[PDB]
Structure formats: structure tokens, C-alpha cells
Amino acid sequence: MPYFLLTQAVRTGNLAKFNQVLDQFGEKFQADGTYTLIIRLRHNVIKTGVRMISLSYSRISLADIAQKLQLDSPEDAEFIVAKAIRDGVIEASINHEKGYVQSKEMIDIYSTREPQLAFHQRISFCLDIHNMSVKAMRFP
Amino acid sequence: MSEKKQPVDEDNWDDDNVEDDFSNQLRAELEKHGYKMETS
Amino acid sequence: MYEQLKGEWNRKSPNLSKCGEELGRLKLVLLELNFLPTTGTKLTKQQLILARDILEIGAQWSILRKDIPSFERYMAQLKCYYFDYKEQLPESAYMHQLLGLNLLFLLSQNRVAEFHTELERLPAKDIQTNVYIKHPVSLEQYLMEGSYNKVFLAKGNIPAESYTFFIDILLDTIRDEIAGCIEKAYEKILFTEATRILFFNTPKKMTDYAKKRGWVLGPNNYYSFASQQQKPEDTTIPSTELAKQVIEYARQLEMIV
Amino acid sequence: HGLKGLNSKLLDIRSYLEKVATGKLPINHQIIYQLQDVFNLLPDVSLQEFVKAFYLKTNDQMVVV
């Protein structure tokens, strides 16, 4: 029930409501041993929004991603578009001719050797069960 | 480090894309589940 | 016994054989009773109360002379005496900004892993009071989202003495990855985007970027160079070793296990 | 037993080819260009589109295994 409210305010843009609940239910949060969320959760309040947009829009302007995030202005837009790539959020690149943020699509997972990399562990796993079976069988 | 540098100026756990996907028709499909094999 | 306690205490400390005499005082400190458990005779911690204070000013001597490997040597021995194994520790007032000196030493050197493992030990000390820790964690709450040179707009709030030696490293550790990110997909910008937004309309900051980095301002632009590759592939380099896996597959499957 | 046959035919053919190069053999318009046509085939295995023949077909046979 306190953990109930904690995750809904991430998706919504209201933070004073989040700071209300943290002030309301901090004693349960401090009983859980999760003191250090708030020093790094306000981080992810605007990171959840920018990944949701970058997953939505394939080629987004800087001049539009701000005003949707109640962020007032096309500079406060790419005040969230230079560590998220460094943190591993979005593939997208930015040209200083248009200021537009466009990402691409992954196709070569079956076209290039992704599957047989993953299979070699699982081939080796299934033969171990056959080896654990026969070695542990004939005790009568 | 590196200010992202700029010039210009309830409780719906993917049960929300379930529940905001869900608001005007089926409540007489909650025990309306069984009346259909003499006519139809 | 209390060798030159407050001789060159406040005004200056130009003396160089004082430090060996101060180390000569520190010869006595580790040789009175002990240091490692410091179990009995609580009065033998009372010079260790002042053995904290003489290394505090020894760290103030190291920040006077800009000695980074000593400043961690003092602070670790202090913190392990703030973690004396008999932790009774009567409260000295110079602890809370000394850790703030440690917390700003460590934040400016990309020790963000060392940051968030430091805060585990002081739950209400670091937040509810202690502006010398409240300011570097409000720095870090600024250092989450988009406030890293808004930090420089909040530069003029130092509660202690100047703190210049580690906001200069904070000047250093920001402006160089600034230069690293403009080498990346931020392709090219004119001189005035380096002026208003980096900061500081033109000092020898233009000498900073033209000499530490390239980016020579020619005709009205900072110019990027080639930062691409060729991407070759063979995919039959594995054809020697993928055959090694297939021979191994029929190896164990045929052997009498 | 296959590739042993491959190595056996190459040690024989260079023994013929070292003799006809220098000193003594008839250099005739037999094999020396009919064997030149053997070099003409020599598929260029690791090139542009053949990579998409091993990564679209070997991983088919990996799933069945």
C-alpha cells in the first residue's frame, strides 16, 4: 500500500504529488531500507518521460519534445538529450543542422550470427542434464 | 558533468494499457458468460 | 607531548621541518598505547581527539600546497579513526565539513560509485542537517537530471572557506567531457555557441579549447574532422572455430558417459 | 578420407609442375591451360552476399538441433 502509490507518479508529470507521498509514507520507506531512492528517483522522473517519447517518435524535433513535457521551451528539451545516450537509453543521433533526434531499427539479429551465439550455451546446457542423468542412474 | 547543453531560452501495472484500454462495454459480460445454446 | 600545538596554526604555515616534527609528533601518537582496537583507557583517545585535529589542519596544509595523494592519505586515516573500533567518538565540530571536503574531493573525480556507497552510513546526518553535506548532495540532486552548469549558476553559495581547489577540478571534469561530447555526434558549432552556453564570454577560454583540443576557429566555425570507420567483416574467421564446436557436439554425444 | 585425397592430388600435380617449369619436360598445350581453368572457378567465399547464406541457413539447422 505505500509501494502502491510510489510507481504511479513516475508515469505522471506531477512531482509535488510524489513529494507528498514520500513525506506521507517515508517511515515505511525508511523501514524497508531504501533510503537512497529519492537522491536518484527525481533523476528518472524526467528520464521515464524522454524514453517514452523516443520510443514513440522515430524522428523528434528538439523544438516540440519540450512543450509536451510542460518544459516551456526548446532548450529545456535537450536538457535531457545528452546523457541518456551515454546512459544507454536511446540509439538516436542529433545533427546540428536540424536539431532533430532520429533513431534506427535493428534488423540483423537473424541476418547475422546472433542466434547461434545464444544456442551454444543452451546446447551445452541440455547435454549436461543428459550427463547428470546417466551418471546418477544405475544405483541399483 | 556536461549539463546537456542548451541555447534556446490508479495502479495499473500495464494494467493501464489494459484499464485505459477498458471503459464503456462489458459489465453484463461479467456474469453474462453462459445463456447461449438453445437459440444460438 | 603536544609538540608545537598551535604555533603556525591560523596565520600561515611556511615551515617544512615542522611537518617532520609534526610527523615526529605522529611518531608519538602511534607509540603511546596503540591505534588499531584502542580498547581500554578512554583517555588515550583524548589525544586521538587532537590527533584528528592535527590531521585536519594537515589536510588543510595539503589543500594549501595542492597535494592530492596526501589529502586522501590524511582523510582515510581520519575516517578510520572516525571508525575507531571502539566508536564512542565525542563530537567535534570540524568533522562535518571535513567529510564535505571529502565529498567534494570525491564527486569531482567521477567517483559516483564511491559517492552513493558513502551515504549509506549517515542517514539523517547527511540530509536533515549538516549544510556541508546537504550542499554536495543538493549538488548531486542537481547532478541527476539537467543541472550540471546550473551548478555553476549556484557556484556563489559556499558555506565554508573558498572551496576553489575542487570547483576547479569540477571546472576541469565538466569542460573536458564537454570537449569529448563535441568530438561525438554533436558535429560542429560556431564560436558564439561556445560563448554564451559553455560559459564566460571570451577570456583565454578560447585558448583552452584551441590548445587542449583542436577545433580551430577558422572562417566563422569550429570544424569537425573524420570520426568514422570502415566496418570490415570476414565471418569465416569463425569457420575454423565454429567447426570446433560442432566436433565437440558429436564428441560428448558419442562417448559412453 | 576425403581431404587426404585432396592433398594426394596436389602433391602429385606440383611434382609434374616443378618438372615442366624448369629443365626437362614437354611444355605442350595440354594441361597447362586446361589446369588454368581450374583456377578460374575458386569461389570467393567470404564476400558481400554469401555471408547472408551462412547466417540465414546455418541457424535454421541450429534450431532443429
From Swiss-Prot, chain A:
Taxonomy, superkingdom: Eukaryota
Modified residues (Phosphoserine): 61, 73
Domain PCI: 1-108
Cleavable signal peptide: none
Family classification: Belongs to the proteasome subunit S3 family.
Function: Component of the 26S proteasome, a multiprotein complex involved in the ATP-dependent degradation of ubiquitinated proteins. This complex plays a key role in the maintenance of protein homeostasis by removing misfolded or damaged proteins, which could impair cellular functions, and by removing proteins whose functions are no longer required. Therefore, the proteasome participates in numerous cellular processes, including cell cycle progression, apoptosis, or DNA damage repair.
Subunit architecture: Component of the 19S proteasome regulatory particle complex. The 26S proteasome consists of a 20S core particle (CP) and two 19S regulatory subunits (RP). The regulatory particle is made of a lid composed of 9 subunits including PSMD3, a base containing 6 ATPases and few additional components. Interacts with UBQLN1 (via ubiquitin-like domain). Interacts with ERCC6.
The name this protein goes by in its record: 26S proteasome non-ATPase regulatory subunit 3
Organism ancestry: Eukaryota, Metazoa, Chordata, Craniata, Vertebrata
Gene behind this protein: PSMD3
UniProtKB/Swiss-Prot annotation, chain B:
Keyword line: Nucleus, Proteasome
Any single GO CC term annotated in Swiss-Prot or TrEMBL for this entry: cytosol
UniProt xrefs under InterPro entries: DSS1_SEM1
Chief location bin: nucleus
UniProt-listed CDD domains: DSS1_Sem1 (cd13768)
Top-level taxon: Eukaryota
UniProt tissue specificity: Expressed in limb bud, craniofacial primordia and skin.
PANTHER family reported for this sequence: 26 PROTEASOME COMPLEX SUBUNIT DSS1, 26S PROTEASOME COMPLEX SUBUNIT SEM1
Protein name stated in the entry: 26S proteasome complex subunit SEM1
Name of the gene encoding the protein in the UniProt record: SEM1
UniProtKB/Swiss-Prot annotation, chain C:
tRNA-binding as UniProt keyword: no
Keyword Nucleotide-binding annotated: no
GO CC field: cytosol; nucleoplasm; nucleus; proteasome accessory complex; proteasome complex; proteasome regulatory particle; proteasome regulatory particle, lid subcomplex
Domain of life: Eukaryota
GO BP: any one term: proteasome-mediated ubiquitin-dependent protein catabolic process
Cross-link Glycyl lysine isopeptide (Lys-Gly) (interchain with G-Cter in SUMO2) residue location(s): 204
Keywords per UniProt: Isopeptide bond, Phosphoprotein, Proteasome, Ubl conjugation
Phosphoserine carried by residues: 13
Domain PCI: start-end pairs: 69-238
Task of the protein: Component of the 26S proteasome, a multiprotein complex involved in the ATP-dependent degradation of ubiquitinated proteins. This complex plays a key role in the maintenance of protein homeostasis by removing misfolded or damaged proteins, which could impair cellular functions, and by removing proteins whose functions are no longer required. Therefore, the proteasome participates in numerous cellular processes, including cell cycle progression, apoptosis, or DNA damage repair.
Subunit comment: Component of the 19S proteasome regulatory particle complex. The 26S proteasome consists of a 20S core particle (CP) and two 19S regulatory subunits (RP). The regulatory particle is made of a lid composed of 9 subunits including PSMD8, a base containing 6 ATPases and few additional components. Interacts with DDI2. Interacts with TASOR.
UniProt family annotation: Belongs to the proteasome subunit S14 family.
Protein name according to UniProt: 26S proteasome non-ATPase regulatory subunit 8
First and last residues shown, out of full length: 94 to 350 of 350
Swiss-Prot record, chain D:
PTM-bearing positions, type N6-acetyllysine: 9, 19
Additional information: Does not bind a metal ion.
Function comment: Component of the 26S proteasome, a multiprotein complex involved in the ATP-dependent degradation of ubiquitinated proteins. This complex plays a key role in the maintenance of protein homeostasis by removing misfolded or damaged proteins, which could impair cellular functions, and by removing proteins whose functions are no longer required. Therefore, the proteasome participates in numerous cellular processes, including cell cycle progression, apoptosis, or DNA damage repair.
Family, per entry: Belongs to the peptidase M67A family.
Binding partners and assembly: Component of the 19S proteasome regulatory particle complex. The 26S proteasome consists of a 20S core particle (CP) and two 19S regulatory subunits (RP). The regulatory particle is made of a lid composed of 9 subunits including PSMD7, a base containing 6 ATPases and few additional components. Within the complex, PSMD7 interacts with subunit PSMD4 through their respective MPN domain. Interacts with TRIM5.
Stated name of the protein: 26S proteasome non-ATPase regulatory subunit 7
Native species: Homo sapiens (Human)
Residues of the full protein shown: 196 to 260 of 324
